[PDB]
Design a protein around this ligand. Structure first.
Ligand SMILES: [Cl-]
Ligand SMILES: [Cl-]
Ligand SMILES: [Cl-]
Length: 115
């Protein structure tokens, strides 16, 4: 409900989802998984912190155009999943990039809505 904070939260996830794309590109070129405890755990926990905040604004966000309760829950899960998958060389490019595009698509609609 407080939307310059929501703005920054959403812009924060946008930045982070872009970062996830670069991480995926790095594990793929390098053909090496990132270290679970030194890289993956801390990263996914930092993503969880942002998501925990954005969940506090659930009631507002679900009411913006293009959003609803179900779509909000899938968006969160999709972002969590990407935050992990981007660290694995075996992650499918086809499925990862499709899910990333879908997440950036939702995030933009939210950004428009909270603005
Ligand atoms: Cl629904
Ligand atoms: Cl739906
Ligand atoms: Cl985006």
């Amino acid at each position: 409900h407080h939307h310059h904070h929501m703005n920054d939260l959403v812009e924060s996830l946008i930045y982070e989802v872009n970062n996830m794309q670069q991480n995926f590109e790095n594990v793929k070129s390098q053909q090496q998984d990132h270290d679970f405890y030194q890289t993956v755990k801390p990263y996914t926990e930092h993503i969880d912190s942002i998501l925990n905040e954005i969940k506090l604004h659930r009631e507002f966000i679900i009411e913006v155009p293009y959003m609803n309760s179900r779509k909000f829950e899938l968006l969160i899960a999709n972002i969590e999943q990407l935050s992990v998958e981007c660290h694995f060389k075996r992650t499918s490019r086809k499925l990862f990039i499709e899910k990333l595009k879908s997440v950036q698509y939702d995030l933009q609609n939210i950004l428009d809505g909270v603005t």
